[PDB]
Structures are given as C-alpha cells and as structure tokens.
Amino acid sequence: SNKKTKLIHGGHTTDDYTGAVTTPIYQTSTYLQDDIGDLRQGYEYSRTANPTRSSVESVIATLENGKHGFAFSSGVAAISAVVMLLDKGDHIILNSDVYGGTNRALTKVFTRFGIEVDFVDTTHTDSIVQAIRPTTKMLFIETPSNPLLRVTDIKKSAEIAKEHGLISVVDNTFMTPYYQNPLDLGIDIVLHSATKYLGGHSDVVAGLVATSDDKLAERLAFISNSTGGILGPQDSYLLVRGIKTLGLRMEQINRSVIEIIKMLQAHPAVQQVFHPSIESHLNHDVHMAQADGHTGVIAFEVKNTESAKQLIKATSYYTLAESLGAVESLISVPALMTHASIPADIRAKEGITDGLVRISVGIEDTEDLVDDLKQALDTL
Amino acid sequence: SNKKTKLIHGGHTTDDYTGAVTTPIYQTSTYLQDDIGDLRQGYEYSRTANPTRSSVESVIATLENGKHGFAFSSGVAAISAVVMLLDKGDHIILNSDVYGGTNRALTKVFTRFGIEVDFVDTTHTDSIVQAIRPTTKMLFIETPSNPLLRVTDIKKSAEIAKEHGLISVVDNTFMTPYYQNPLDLGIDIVLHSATKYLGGHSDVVAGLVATSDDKLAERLAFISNSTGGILGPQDSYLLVRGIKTLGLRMEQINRSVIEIIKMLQAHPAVQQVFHPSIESHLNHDVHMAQADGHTGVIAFEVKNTESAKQLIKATSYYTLAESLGAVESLISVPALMTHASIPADIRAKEGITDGLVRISVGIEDTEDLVDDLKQALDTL
Amino acid sequence: SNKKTKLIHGGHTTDDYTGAVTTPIYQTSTYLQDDIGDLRQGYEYSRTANPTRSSVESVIATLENGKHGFAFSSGVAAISAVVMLLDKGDHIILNSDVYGGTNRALTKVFTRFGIEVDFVDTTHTDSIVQAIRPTTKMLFIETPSNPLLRVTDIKKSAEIAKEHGLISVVDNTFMTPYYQNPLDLGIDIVLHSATKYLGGHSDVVAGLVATSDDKLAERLAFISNSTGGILGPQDSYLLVRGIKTLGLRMEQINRSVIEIIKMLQAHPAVQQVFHPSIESHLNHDVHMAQADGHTGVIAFEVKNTESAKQLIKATSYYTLAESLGAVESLISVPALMTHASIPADIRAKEGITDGLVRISVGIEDTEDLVDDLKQALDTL
Amino acid sequence: SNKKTKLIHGGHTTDDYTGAVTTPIYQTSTYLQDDIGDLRQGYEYSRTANPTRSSVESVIATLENGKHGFAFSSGVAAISAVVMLLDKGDHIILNSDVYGGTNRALTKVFTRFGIEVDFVDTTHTDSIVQAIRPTTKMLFIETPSNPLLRVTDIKKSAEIAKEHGLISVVDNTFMTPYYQNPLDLGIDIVLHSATKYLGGHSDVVAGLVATSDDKLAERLAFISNSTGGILGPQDSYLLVRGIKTLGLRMEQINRSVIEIIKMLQAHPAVQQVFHPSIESHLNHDVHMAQADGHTGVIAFEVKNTESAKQLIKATSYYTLAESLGAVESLISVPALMTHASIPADIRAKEGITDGLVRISVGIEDTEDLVDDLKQALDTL
Ligand SMILES: *Cc1c(COP(=O)(O)O)cnc(C)c1O
Ligand SMILES: *Cc1c(COP(=O)(O)O)cnc(C)c1O
Ligand SMILES: *Cc1c(COP(=O)(O)O)cnc(C)c1O
Ligand SMILES: *Cc1c(COP(=O)(O)O)cnc(C)c1O
Ligand code: NA
Ligand code: NA
Ligand code: NA
Ligand code: NA
Ligand code: NA
Ligand code: NA
Ligand code: NA
Ligand code: NA
C-alpha cells in the first residue's frame, strides 16, 4: 500500500523453504541437477542467476514498478551494461553535467567501440530534440545532476524518446525509488548506483537496473551473463537489508535538508545554494511534478578554497570522504576532488568555483547538523 | 621457496595494523581523508581499490610471477576487461574450441563493437601465423581446452605474438598457477576463472588477471575502474582462503587423475579418452614441457546418450552439476549441456559425440573414485 | 549531542588504519606478535578480543553511558554470564513475569549450581525489600516485561540494591538505549538481547552488556574469556550496522504504536490493552519518569483462541513468527506459543487468556498497520 | 567409504531446495510459521536451531561416528556446556596437564558452583581408578596433551568410566576426527576446539561436540538452548568449508612432522623432543593402537630463553602467534606464553623449561620447513 510498507513487504525477501524471514546468502557457484537439464528451482550457475541476487533484483523491480531487475558489481557496471545495448555507429545523448564516471566510461571506453556521444543541456528538452541525429539510439539523463543539482523533465524526455525511437534511461541514484519513479513516467530503463542511498550504509559497491520491457530485459540478461559484472550474494544480501530502512532514512535526510537550506540561505558567509527545493531553482516546478521529495545532496558557495577547507576542519559532524548516501553526513569540495583536472577558468565558467562545497546530508539529528554547519560557517 | 610454501606465504594476506593472520574483510565503500587528497593508506573509494581485493590481487600476481593483479566479479568479466584493451577494427585470434562463454562474449557482444574474431586450430602454431592480419592485435589461447583437452604451445605462441606485435593472453584456468605459469614463458597477460580451481570450493564466482607489463596494467586498471566489474570483499576473502589449499588439492586431484585414466583405458565400455597425460595425445610433449602437472578435467567416450545417463545415475561419488574445480568430483555430458545448440552432425564431426562424458576430478579418495566409476561403467 | 547523532558517531566504528568508514570484519582467530608478549594493537586471540567485536562493545558502552561493553553469542548467553558473577549459595531476585528463557536458565540450569532464585512482583519495590535474604546478591529486573508490559521503578530498584549491597541488573531489551538508560539511574549492569531491536533486522542472534563498574567489568571479561559465549565478527558487524538506524526505527515504531493503541481501545472486538503509554496502566507515571519513549510490543485481548487465529489469518502486514524488534510487524499468541506448558487455569489467573494477542510493531506505514489490524478485527 | 571421501560427502552440506552445492548461510534469527506451531522445516528461532549450524553439526556427528552434533561459539563454550551436565557436589577427573583454558574454567568458574575437580596423571589409567570418589560423575581427558604431548589410553578410560558410571569425555582437538575417533572406543562425548585444525584457516573461533547417546544429546541441547553459547551461521559455514580439506591438510602436516622430528633428533642444539610418534615416548604403543596418524604439534628443548627467541627470529616460515592448526606453521615458547604465571622452579620440575619451544606444523613444503628450522637451529 503506502511506500514504507512496500519497502518492507515488496519483493521476495524470505526463504520459501525454511521460512527464514531474511534472504539466505547463497555463497555458492553451482547447483545439483536431478536429471540433465532438470533444475530444481531454476538455478544452474551463479553467474547466470543466484537466489540472493534474485532477491535484490525482485526488490528493485518492485520499488521502481518494473518487471525485471538486474544487480551489477557497481553503478558503472550497470551503466556499461546498459550502454552495451548499442552497437558501433550508434549515438547516445546524455545530460551535459552527467556523473564523472559515466562521462569517462562513454568518452574513454565506449567511443573506442564506435559509440558516439553528445552531451547536451537537457534542462531544456528542445535541446534534446535539436541534438537527435539519424544514428541516435539512446537518451540517458540524471536528474537531479551532480554537483549543481540540475533538473531535467523526465516525462517530456520519455515522450521525445518514444517519438524518435530512442531507448530512454534515467540514472535515478540521487532521488531513489522512494521519491521518483521514472518507469511510471514512460522511461524504458531506470538504474542506480546502489552504493549510495539504497545500500545506505557505505559498505556495498553495487548497481541496480529495472525495466518493464521484456525485450530490453532479455538483452540486459544476455549482456549480464556474457560480460559478467554481477553482484555477489553477500553484497546482494546487504543491499536488501539496507533498503529496508530507505524510507525512514530518506525522510530524516529530507527534514534536515529543509532546515540546512534555510540556514545556508540566511548565512552571510554563503552565496549561491544549489538544490531543487529552492523555488528560484531552474525547473523547480518540473522536479515537484515528477518527485515527491528531495535528494540529500546540496552544493553551496563559500568565498574560496581556504574558506572551504576551514569549513571542513571546523565541522564536528560532517565527514570528509568520497561518495554520498551514507548514514553519516559527508562533505567535499568538487573543484579539488572531482573536477581538479578541468582547467580553472572552465571550472569557474561552469560554476565549479573554488569555494563550492558539496554536502551529502546523513541521518544525524537535524538540530545538530544545522548548528554544526552554522557554527563552522561562523568561523569564516 | 617451493610451491606449497609460496602458496601460504606469497602475497600480502595479513593485517599490518592489528597483526591478524588473515586478510580483514573491508565491507566498505569509502574512506576517511585526513586532508583533501591525503589518503591514509592509498584507499579512497572501493570500486577503485579495496584492501581485501588488493590482498587477492597480490596473491594472484605472486603466484603467476607477475607484477600486477586484478580481481573481477567473474571469469567472463576478466575476459571482457582484457578484450576491451582493443578498439573497433582490431582483430583477435583465439583457439578454435575456446570456452563457450568466451566464444559468446566475442561473437555476440564485442563484434557489435567492431572487434573482429578468428577461431583457429592453435595446436599447430603456424595456423596462428597464417591467420595473422594487418589488423590483428591480440592472441588469446586456452591450454588445455574444453572438453577435449587440446594443448597449445605457450612459448611459441608468445614468440609469435612478440614478433607480430600482438598482446598475448592465456586463459590458465584448467592448469592453475600451481602447474603452469604463462608469464614465465613470455605471455603478456594471464587470466583465470577463479570460480573453478583457485577458489576450489564452488562458493565464489570470480575472475583473476595478472601481468608484468606496467602499461597493460595501467590500461586494465583504467578499464576496471571505468566499467566496474570488480570482485567484492567477501568473495576476495573466500578466494584468498581457498587458494591456501590449492597445492594440496591439485596434488590429490592429479593422483586420482592418473589412476582414473588407467582404469578408463582398460575398460571395454570406454572408447577414446582425452587428457594431456596420455602419451598418444596431440602435443603431449608440449604440455610436459610447459607444465609440471595436469588438469583434473577428463573427457571420455561411452557408447551413446543412454549409456552416459546410466553412468551418471550409477555413480555414488560423481555429482551432476555445471562448472569444475570443486572439492567434489563433477560429471556432465557436453553434447547435452554445453553444445546442445550445435547441430548433431557438426557435434559428431567435432568429436562431441552423444556418449562423450566429462568429469572434473575432486579430492575424494583415489580408490573410491576409481572403483565408483569402474562399477558404474560395469553396469553398461 | 542529540540521540540520533550519538547513534551515528558514538563508539569507534571506523578503521584507523585505512580510514574505512565502516568497521572491518576481522574474520580471524589469532594475531602476529612482533616479539613474545608484544601485541601490535592489543590483540592476541579472538576469543579474548576481536577488533570487530570491540567495535560493537564500544557502541553499546557509549549508547548506555557505560564504560565497558561485552558482546555475547545470544541474549541468554549475556544473562548466563551475568548470573555467573554469583556463587553457590547466592540468591537472586527477579521480576515475577521475567522472560521465559531467563526463567528456564535460572530454575533449570543455575539452581543445579546452588544459585537460589525468588520471583517477586517488582511493580511494588517494597516487594523487593521484603524478599531480600541475608544471602541475596543480585537484583535482576526487566521493564517493561513480556507479554503484559509490567513496569518496574528502575531508580528505586537501584537505591534498594545499593542499600543492601546487591548487584543491580536491568534487561533493557524492550526499551533499547534510545529510550531508557538504566546505568544513568544507578543500575550496576544493563543488558540486551541484541537479537531484537538493536540488530533490528531479524538476522543476528546476539547479546550485549554494558557497565560503568571497573571491577564488575573485569569479572565479566574473565567469565567471557573462560566460558566463551562470544559474538563472532560477522554478527558484530551486522549489529553495528543495524544500530545505525535504531533511532529512526524506534521513532517510526512509536508513531505507529500510538495510533494502533487508539484503534485497539476504540474497537468493540478488543477488551483489555496492555502497554505503558496507556495512562490507566500500572506505573505509567514511573515509566514516563524513567524513559522518553515506548516499546513497540503491545498485548491485547480478543475473545478466544479462534478469534486470535482469525485475526492472524486476516492481517496482510502482520507476520506470524517468534521474536520481536524486526522491521516487519510480528504477531503471536502467548497462550499457544510461550505459555502453552503452563496449566490453563493458571494462565487465565495470570492474564494469559486464550485470546491474548501480542504484536511487535514494525516500521511499515502507520496508516497501513492501523487499517490492516482494524479490518482484521472487523472480521470478528 | 574411505576417509577423504567421507570428508567430502559426509553430513548434509547442500541445499535441498535450490540444489546449491554448498550450505546456504542463514543469516536470520526467526522463521515464518504457516500456522501456530507448524514449522515448515523444523526451524522456529535461530538460537534453538539454525540450518547452517545444523549443517556443521551433521558434519561433526558424521566424522566422529556419532548421532548428534552441537556447535558452540568457542572450544571453551563447548567445554562449559559439557561441564554443565554436572550438578553442585559432583566431581570431575581431568588429566593433569589439561589445556590452560580448561583448567581455568574448572578451577576459577565451576568450582564456585560446587563442581569438584581433581587433576590426575592419566598416562596410567589406574591413577584414574584411584582418584574416583563416590561423588565422581565425569572423566575428561585430552590425548595427546599440550605442550608435552602426553598420551592417555582412550579405550581403558572408557571401560573405567562405564564400570563406575561416569560420563566419559575426550577433547579430540589435537588429533581431529581424521585420525582418532573416541566414540568408536566407547567414550560418551567427544569435543573439539574447531578454532584449530577443523576450521584449519585461523579465521573461526568455534567448538564442536558429538555424541551417540540420545539422553546426553537431549541434555546438551537443553543447555545450549538455555545458556546460548551457539556458533553463528557465517562461522558455521566457514567451518564446513575448512573441514572439506581436513584430510589433505592433516596428511601434508604429518609428512612434515615425520621429517622435522628426524631433523630435531639429529640436531646438536636440540635436547629432548616430545611427540607420540617417537618410539621411546611414553604410551607410544597406546597412541598407535587408538589413532592412525599424528598431531602436528611438536615440543622440543633448546638451551635457554635467548636460544628460543633466536630460533624464532631466525626462521623464515614459522610465525610467532598463539593457537595451532593453521595453514601456516606457528611457533611459541610455553614458559613465556602459556605458563608464565607458574613459578619458575615448578615449571622446570614440570618440564616447561625456559628453552622449550612448541611448533604447530602447517602445510608449507616439507623440505622448506625442515631446512628453515634446521638453519635457524644452526645459528645457535
Ligand atoms: C502497497 C504495496 C504495493 C503497491 O504498489 P503501488 O505503489 O501501489 O504501485 C505493492 N507491493 C506491496 C508489498 C505493497 O505493500
Ligand atoms: C619461494 C617463495 C618465492 C619464490 O618464488 P619463485 O617460484 O622462486 O619465483 C616467493 N615468495 C614466497 C613467499 C616464497 O616462499
Ligand atoms: C552528543 C554525543 C555524546 C554525548 O552523550 P550524552 O547523551 O550527552 O551523554 C557522545 N558521543 C557522541 C558521538 C555524541 O554525538
Ligand atoms: C565411506 C562413507 C561413510 C562410512 O563411514 P565409516 O568410516 O565406514 O564408518 C559414511 N558416509 C560417507 C559419505 C562415506 O563416504
Ligand atoms: Na516480501
Ligand atoms: Na513504458
Ligand atoms: Na604472505
Ligand atoms: Na614478458
Ligand atoms: Na564514531
Ligand atoms: Na552507578
Ligand atoms: Na553430503
Ligand atoms: Na558407547
């Protein structure tokens, strides 16, 4: 029924055999056959299918209102699997500020295989319409994007993809299925780095893919079985476990996000703030129309590099580390940690200023997170 | 010093911090930074590197006398990573009877990316010389092959690859580093499905890659980090653990292999036997020159399908399942389980007769394995 | 600072060595010594101490405002360890309706070792004063108790224990350290079945003990090292992980508890309801004075056995299984599942009627849990 | 049939449901009931029984030719469970040089519960007959003992126990079920620290108990369920896995033991050597009559403390750490590491000289182990 209930009872996460209320961890590679070709429960070799992996796949398919789920050894393995739906000579459109790892996979690996890539500003969907070529086969968007939280209209992107015969893909990592369900808006494929919010505990690297399209699912299954970027059973188990608390975690994160943004906007040491909840944010109305909550990633400007470092040093409850979606709040400086290879003037033109700070809000107490960040900013 | 000692003390498989005599399982995705860019022990994000995965990589690099190791979520993920060293328009030579999964990856996935593939009978290395094109960039061989145990000269293949500027690759799964070290014979890259003998307990799906070439290692690391088919920490731990007993397991397996082959050759219900230890086997001398032991996979002919099924039904200690390299002895019928899609007349011409049985010898008692198989064959 | 922050940052749950943001799983039994007697980080043998177990011990000590934590293979192993502080001839007072497993350990195991036991109604603390003998050494109370949620005054019990020289012990399982901290009220030892709320995911059997008393801690450590009921590293890791979300889980559970109790009190098919939040509940004021929240266990009366079974059959979201503190809501019938050995007339006199149902509220949506239970009760 | 086959196929270590060829890891605490009291496969609560633990219990029961197996969180938890079969006022006879942990449990924990203990030299079984009191209920022996490898006649001890109505117990850790089966010689209960040879990889702390007596098994099950020192599922899985290679590991260890003893006896820097294979060893004939192999623990005398430390420093392949039964060879000095609390003159009288070294032989190459130890001794 409601979302928090679906999180607990959706998918198959018990043992039909013993009745165990959690998914058994099938730390196994192969399965007895009673007769040649006779599989007891459809399992024959763990790369092809493993019952613990099957549990997490059924969870993600249920949570995204899809029919088929796929678990990969990482988010970028999920993305590579989806890209391998294309052939040499095919063209893919992606949002301009797509995740660094995605950019690098496409432009340094798959272009060597003749996949062509155009990055376009998808915040105006007619940009997509202009970028479509006769060879375009896929449209791939994140929304909201990193680290400036740009919002793209999912439903219009799906309509455009249908009209021009494109496979539409949404990287739904930042929003999670708790707040945004692209398959319900006509998208063909949805994917996640489950490394972030879904696992939620910074202890699994994993990717998840869901679709309702039987033919795309057959192609993804063939690619998964042939190139073998499968999630293992222990990690699939930890994923199922972490997803149980997704709704509670996201709701705590959203309460803190709202309060922290109020604080950041009022603070004299903070200039611009980037988050889709701000009503002056580009495509705020679009986000509210396609999601019923918010990501916990916020970016905001302080004065300069030394201000950003001082902020990090002065906070008690914000931890300096890579990734997002932990139970801890995480803090980072994109210009030094994710965009340092880009020339400084291009960074500045892009908005990746030296004093741009990104925080991933965790599940600590809201008052503590607000007060800690505020007192740290007061030291500037 | 000697091999069984190297298996125990080779690589880094203890904890420098606590002194734990086994590798800690770093079930974690990210790492604290003391200052932006300052990594305590070189770790920053588990997809890029994880200390448990690093342990298993150092083991495989040590055991194959390489410098760099890489752990993937499966053998075919290792193979796909190695193939992605090539570009659209490049050509790869492989041995004709290469593993089904490898064949399928190359001909159904990578040909869509403009990689060209020729299967040649590498049991005569001048076949390789004839198949070389101006676009050939890689030579990929298994030895011995499945299920007919064809043997290819590793050292001559490495010489050919060097002369013509090819990346040489050996799939060393069937022999393990305990018996055959292709890097010592001039091969550029060696790889394994660690799912089989290395893990040795049918409870991990994993691939392992080793090289001594710094530039190839940098390219493999980039591909691993970008396409993300990484082995997880729990599976890396189980791999290290299983490798500890590799030498003891392989030696038990070899004792049983020798005795079982004597029995099969004497038995009137058995026709041809396929294994490199048989002195009439093609390239027996080559195998003995490049390896100091044997694989546990044996194929042999009984009369027909019903004879093969009866054999399976009558054995007490041979288990019907996919894969090989378990502690259990495994039995299968290729014509029904791995080559059933190939037309029957082409199967027969290839030697995959209806009564061709493959066994993967386990570590049960040698007398029990010989007597069990013999009494089962007596029922024919 | 506040509780939800303490849950995330309290205790030592990162790796000082690599910076891993989660506790490494030290699946190891022994540790290298650089010189005889020189331990690198104080570890020498995992039964005596294991770094993952040490992490969960530091968490429980922090959350209960104690100084020392101890992790056992189960709640009843924790209880047996605490009882083994006593000698033959010593006497222990426990609350009359103490947990079945505790009752059975004391009366069927430890009485054979000359420990004497008296069960008294501790809802009046002068009952304790009357039951004290010259040989009494320990006072052991749960509050609230199972399944009728009887409340005992913790602070008065601690005062009584101090005056008469007793070791005071509170089984704090039902309330968790999120809502009730007995060590702050003068109790000597606090313990939990971490199997329930603390792990929170029905996938670990474990017990946890905390104290601020150095001498009691030394005695507990000696008993743990000598009788060896230690929690393993994988289970300690899963405990730390589950505790991260304790506050969010307990708060969701409490919201649902309040709404479900309103529904049960209004429903004509329900008679008596047992829970400390009801203002007519015995010692309601005491509970509110010693806790700032509620347990998720509720008991209530329907008409008879068949009514109770019908309730179970008609609910969509209440799962029939043993234990409590899961993310799922659990339902059971004490008279059939925990008190079936007690004669029926004594059960009735005790309030364990045939139609007494116990539910352990999970983290499903509050409206769904209320509506599901209400429609099921409507079918009566 | 033969032992190495029994190791692979004995016990239930596959999944009847999916056919998985390894035991699933049931990381779970509780089980769905289809109707109140109706258990699908007999599981209801993991402390009482867990399917992974059940797998390892069936293995140990099979390997010791018993009917019932029990897995505990440690060897000393197994021992405490067995001791709790007795009551206050009961008396137990143990061999004089029993393991330190056992001595400490009995004399510092269970004597406080009125269990009486006598340590007697059981190398002469009439010592047992003399020590029997009217209150004696249990006879507990290790053979061979630590660190001087004293041998006790198992079959005569069982006869004595039967005649006088004693529960007979053998701690079979040092020999493993691969070489010595006390239940076959009339002993009531056999137990192991599975931490050592059975797990075999220094990564599990665990105890195992087997019996053929239904009534003793019912009592042990009650004690296990009531005091809760149960092995967890992940550790039970690793135990099953490690036991697979027990036979191969023990046979390698025995080959090295024989060669190392030849070397030690010939070496001028070595005085007395302690091991049951030496024909001048007390009760050598008894050992050969009750076992068909040897433990890997050897003790031998060098001159003094500094000689012992120099030996440790000079060996390349012997690791300084506690415990035994690893794949690594381990080295230690009892007088400094296990008997340092005993006064020096009593140590000397007992044979625990300052230069007494204990090695636990691992599975490294035999020549390497012999040559490494010999060159280290040459440096004296
Ligand atoms: C409520 C519920 C659903 C319904 O999903 P929708 O969001 O309505 O599409 C599915 N599965 C479970 C377990 C549920 O509780
Ligand atoms: C013996 C040994 C080596 C030497 O390897 P080679 O086979 O001689 O190339 C390396 N590492 C360890 C731990 C060894 O024991
Ligand atoms: C707030 C906080 C504390 C303080 O605990 P009290 O409840 O005030 O006794 C301790 N540790 C951490 C990590 C905290 O955040
Ligand atoms: C051989 C065998 C047995 C027989 O055990 P004994 O040592 O003869 O008592 C039992 N189980 C299995 C699986 C065997 O292979
Ligand atoms: Na479900
Ligand atoms: Na659609
Ligand atoms: Na090493
Ligand atoms: Na080379
Ligand atoms: Na902390
Ligand atoms: Na106190
Ligand atoms: Na079996
Ligand atoms: Na007997």
Side-chain angles (χ1 to χ4, degrees), chain D residues 166-188:
Chain D
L166 316 181
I167 304 168
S168 54
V169 189
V170 168
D171 183 332
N172 197 35
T173 299
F174 271 30
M175 291 313 303
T176 85
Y178 192 71
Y179 286 136
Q180 184 170 266
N181 304 114
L183 299 188
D184 283 348
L185 303 174
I187 294 301
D188 293 316

Side-chain angles (χ1 to χ4, degrees), chain C residues 192-214 216-302 304-305 307-375:
Chain C
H192 302 260
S193 169
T195 310
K196 321 287 170 77
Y197 290 106
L198 284 162
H201 292 73
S202 319
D203 62 1
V204 175
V205 171
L208 291 173
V209 182
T211 186
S212 294
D213 187 305
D214 290 351
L216 291 178
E218 181 178 13
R219 291 165 63 185
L220 287 173
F222 183 88
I223 287 158
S224 176
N225 191 63
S226 303
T227 55
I230 57 156
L231 193 63
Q234 190 68 53
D235 294 294
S236 316
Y237 178 79
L238 288 165
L239 264 193
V240 165
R241 195 191 204 249
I243 287 163
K244 305 301 191 186
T245 53
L246 179 64
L248 305 192
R249 291 185 283 104
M250 292 313 287
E251 286 185 355
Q252 173 73 14
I253 287 168
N254 269 232
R255 292 191 288 269
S256 301
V257 158
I258 297 318
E259 296 305 308
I260 289 166
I261 284 175
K262 283 172 188 166
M263 188 275 290
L264 288 172
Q265 286 170 325
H267 200 281
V270 170
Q271 289 121 71
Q272 295 254 281
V273 181
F274 302 89
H275 191 268
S277 64
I278 298 162
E279 311 189 281
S280 72
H281 195 86
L282 170 65
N283 282 336
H284 167 87
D285 58 331
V286 168
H287 180 82
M288 302 308 309
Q290 66 193 17
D292 52 24
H294 288 295
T295 187
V297 172
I298 308 162
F300 59 92
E301 294 173 348
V302 291
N304 47 51
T305 298
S307 285
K309 287 184 172 174
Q310 169 55 31
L311 195 56
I312 288 172
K313 275 312 170 263
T315 48
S316 280
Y317 304 130
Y318 295 77
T319 298
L320 176 66
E322 287 284 344
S323 192
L324 55 139
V327 295
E328 299 87 357
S329 308
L330 299 183
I331 188 150
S332 67
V333 184
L336 296 168
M337 294 172 62
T338 62
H339 295 59
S341 44
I342 297 165
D345 43 313
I346 289 131
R347 279 205 310 267
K349 181 167 160 325
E350 230 59 44
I352 313 305
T353 67
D354 279 359
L356 185 81
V357 177
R358 193 193 72 177
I359 54 169
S360 157
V361 174
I363 62 168
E364 299 99 337
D365 182 75
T366 296
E367 281 180 50
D368 289 337
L369 289 178
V370 173
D371 295 349
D372 189 39
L373 194 54
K374 188 187 172 296
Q375 64 83 22

Side-chain angles (χ1 to χ4, degrees), chain B residues 116-154:
Chain B
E116 310 277 30
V117 185
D118 275 283
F119 303 86
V120 315
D121 194 335
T122 54
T123 59
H124 201 310
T125 54
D126 281 344
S127 279
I128 301 156
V129 177
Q130 186 190 316
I132 288 180
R133 304 164 185 265
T135 55
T136 304
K137 301 293 173 186
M138 181 172 283
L139 170 63
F140 183 111
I141 63 170
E142 315 158 327
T143 175
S145 64
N146 180 71
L148 299 181
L149 288 311
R150 295 195 175 91
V151 166
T152 295
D153 190 322
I154 294 175

Side-chain angles (χ1 to χ4, degrees), chain A residues 8-24 55 237 240-241 244, chain C residues 195 200-204 318-331, chain D residues 26-33 40 43-46 50-51:
Chain A
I8 301 307
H9 298 283
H12 181 60
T13 66
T14 65
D15 180 25
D16 283 346
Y17 187 50
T18 72
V21 300
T22 58
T23 307
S55 176
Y237 178 79
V240 165
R241 195 191 204 249
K244 305 301 191 186
Chain C
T195 310
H201 292 73
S202 319
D203 62 1
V204 175
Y318 295 77
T319 298
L320 176 66
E322 287 284 344
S323 192
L324 55 139
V327 295
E328 299 87 357
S329 308
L330 299 183
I331 188 150
Chain D
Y26 284 89
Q27 193 67 65
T28 200
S29 68
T30 187
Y31 306 80
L32 302 169
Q33 297 182 26
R40 295 193 184 165
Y43 295 95
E44 84 194 294
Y45 191 72
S46 272
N50 172 288

